[PDB]
Amino acid sequence: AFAGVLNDADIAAALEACKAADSFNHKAFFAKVGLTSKSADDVKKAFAIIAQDKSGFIEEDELKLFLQNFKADARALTDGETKTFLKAGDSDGDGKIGVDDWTALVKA
Ligand SMILES: [Ca+2]
């Protein structure tokens, strides 16, 4: 999956780990799905696939649909989860996550 960067089994396990509302954590997910150990180049590919906006930036509203990039009928993140995700990843403060924010977040 994701241009071969992630394998189906890891993704399945990561989604099962966070089925419960408010059980998602970006760091836990990145680890389990196996992205954290990937090269920046692969990490950035994952970002480009995930980001829906031609602007190149992911808004909080879109983060809500985060798991649905991995499985179409996955749950939406809760507002608590998206708030947490956004605060951790928006290193520069513009309210969004760009590729730079994403790469730093994943690999930190
Ligand atoms: Ca930002």
Exposed, middle or buried, 20 (CB in 10 Å: 0-12/13-18/19+)? exposed
Closest CA to 58 of 68, 48, 71, 70: 48
Give residues whose Cβ lies within 5 Å of ion ligand 1.
90, 92, 94, 96, 101
CA distance 105 to 108: 5
Topology (CATH level 3) of domain 1-108 = Recoverin; domain 1 (1.10.238)
**Beta carbons within 8 Å of 53's beta carbon, 6+ residues apart:** 59, 62
Compute, in angstroms, the gap from residue 9 CA to the centroid of ligand 1: 31
Q: Which segments of 1-108 does DSSP mark as H helices, in order? A: 8-17, 26-33, 40-50, 60-63, 79-89, 99-107
Please provide residue 22's backbone torsions phi and psi, each rounded to the nearest 5 degrees: 65, 15
Compute, in angstroms, the gap from residue 92 CA to the centroid of ligand 1: 5
The end-to-end CA distance of the chain, in Å, is 23
Compute, in angstroms, the gap from residue 89 CA to the centroid of ligand 1: 7
CA distance 75 to 21: 8
Instruction: Give the resolution to one decimal, in Å.
Output: 1.7
Please provide residue 11's backbone torsions phi and psi, each rounded to the nearest 5 degrees: -65, -45
Compute, in angstroms, the gap from residue 2 CA to the centroid of ligand 1: 23
Q: Are the beta carbons of 10 and 31 closer than 8 angstroms? A: no
Experimentally, the structure was elucidated by X-ray
Domain ranges of the chain: 1-108
